[model samples]
Target: GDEAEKQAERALELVRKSPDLLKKLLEAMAEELKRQGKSPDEIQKAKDEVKTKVEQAIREWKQGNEEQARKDMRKVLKSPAFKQAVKVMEEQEPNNPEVQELKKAMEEAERGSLEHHHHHH
Candidate 1:
């Protein structure tokens, strides 16, 4: 059990890295979701639906319309849906696995070298 925990800390270690670390984490999440019998199409459909406005904002940025892009992002980011999502995650049960896992990764990120990273709090 100790060994498994140690191994998972390496998962935390990987999470300690920058943006690229997030890419791996999400892919791993999707893989597990698929392993649990979710269809790729269904998962992608939900992801696309959830990311609709953010995607549009990115597209606007790519098209050299920074003002429009920022406006689009603000629209979604400031929306009630986004705020509610934030509230849910922010106030999860103390020991919820999602909270624990994210806390571990956050701890990794806050390791002595916290200076290099921007902390939300």
Candidate 2:
């Protein structure tokens, strides 16, 4: 089934609507770079690159190109940089509700789930 792809689309749609989520994600990546002792300029450069990539993905979404948007965002979501950012977030804020919610959403996006909203029994 392509249900997992649907899930990913839904999750990413949320990210597109609330662009601040993307901002927070980039901030987390920057924090991870800082933890690695990267210089400020290098961190800024990397962050700006990622931000531009994210902007492109969002623009793709806005332009009604689902495949392109997915291609771009899947790279961002599955990148080592984002994974390391998740690690940094877990260490720094284990009780962050938003992080937990986002983690669950990503997990479902990848693995699929039965948690849909259709109550017609």
Candidate 3:
């Protein structure tokens, strides 16, 4: 349990540390939205709204408390939307510096067996 919690925190830190790249990934998702036939304005509005929420989330996280922000981050990170956001980054440029940093953070955060949670049972 301790290891799981720690890994989650590290993953969140990876997200927090890479706002610009994160935004870029979100921006690219615009194409997917267009393909999905969201009206142009609807796509733009949702893109802007979701991206700002994450930026705001990290900004508030900067004022950190002992474990609560980590707690908060874990919650955010687990959401389906969060995973989709990360997926955009992964698909776009897994080799980019920020993505590289995220991989490093995830490596450092690594815990055995638990990584399998990424797979469907």
Candidate 4:
């Protein structure tokens, strides 16, 4: 318990001293935990799960399962798990520069998707 407490204190200090470092450390820790076959949080688990689902959808689409792929995409978009994962990532990264870039990319993607879909109709 003492060791755990000490480690936690150290982590807190690192976070306070440099949030960027904290974010990087958290991401690295999360990746390590994933490699160890563990889910440290819902977000990490959801990200992996969504990737699999997306891959499956792509396969289904390639197999002429257009409807299925659309359904899967809808599910992916509406997924509470995926939302949770995004939320966790947002919290972990906060206002860090890397996260800001990611947020901008996300916005651009959303805008592009909207424009592309609008023309499809």
Candidate 5:
């Protein structure tokens, strides 16, 4: 049980590095845990936390706070707890279209913002 939890955590932490894999892993772990009659509340909570962090990172990125966003993402990617959370999501929906879209939007926004910043400087 603990090993599963640990594995899930590690997977979640790598969301930023390999989001597709992390999401798939998390979803699978959640399913496995559910089958074992275990509550995935902890994993769910961790997912929520990562979502919040990502949103914040996006906001920071939009505001041209690249350094801060990178720092936050790094923190998230390096955290064992967060990795577990990502594992749960990955297992459930490895190629979540919504997540992919969001990532794309964030990238566009960042690029636009940086271009604007450069011109203004």
Candidate 6:
């Protein structure tokens, strides 16, 4: 449980540190969704929904609700909408460094395979 929780915290922490990256990725997701024939309003609504969910998760983290923060973040990260957005982004821009980076972190968090190296010497 702790390992999974820490990974979630770390992933969301990365997002908090890179708001611009998140914006860029979301914009890309919106464009890709539009290209795939989604309605304009639906595209914007999906983007806003993810944005709102992320902001709420970060807010919880800032308020020191560690448990709730990680919990909420995992929910957002593992959401179907977020996963679909990421999948489309990957398929459309496989070579984009940002997409790869975001996907890497998200995947690690999803699988709880995050490596933790501690210095105890």
lDDT of 6: 0.71
lDDT of 2 by residue, 9-116 (tens): 655676677667667776887887887898898777767766776678778878898877766665555455656555666777789765666566566654553334
**Residue pairs of candidate 2 with colliding backbone atoms:** none
Could you tell me the lDDT of residue 71 within candidate 6? 74
Clashes of each: 0, 0, 0, 1, 20, 0
Please give the distance, in angstroms, between residue 7's alpha carbon in candidate 2 and its true position after superposition.
5.9
Residue 34 in model 5: lDDT: 57
In the range 1-121, model 3's lDDT, one tens digit per residue, is 4554565567666666766666665576666666667688766765665566555556656777536555555443443344445566778787777766555444444442133345210
- Model 6, range 43-94, lDDT digits (tens) per residue? 8887887788778889998988877877777765655566666777688788
| Cα distance off (Å), candidate 3, residue 99 | 3.2
How would the candidate models be sorted by lDDT, starting from the highest?
A: 6, 2, 3, 5, 4, 1
- Model 4 regions more than 4 Å off: 1-41, 81-121
Candidate 1 lDDT by residue in tens digits, 1-121: 1233332233333333333533433333344445558778755543444356555655665677655555554433323333333334445455555445644533443342223223211
Residue-wise lDDT of candidate 5 within 1-121, one digit each (tens)?
1232232233223454555644554454445445556656765665566567655765665687755665565444444444344345545566976444333433333333332212100
- Highest TM-score: give the candidate number: 6
Task: Give candidate 2 misplaced runs (Cα > 4 Å).
Answer: 1-11, 92-97, 105-121
- Cα lDDT, all candidates: 0.42, 0.65, 0.56, 0.45, 0.47, 0.71
- The candidate maximizing lDDT is 6
Q: Candidate 1 vs candidate 5: which has greater lDDT?
A: 5
User: Cα deviation in Å at residue 73, candidate 5?
Assistant: 0.6
Cα displacement (Å) at residue 35, model 1: 26
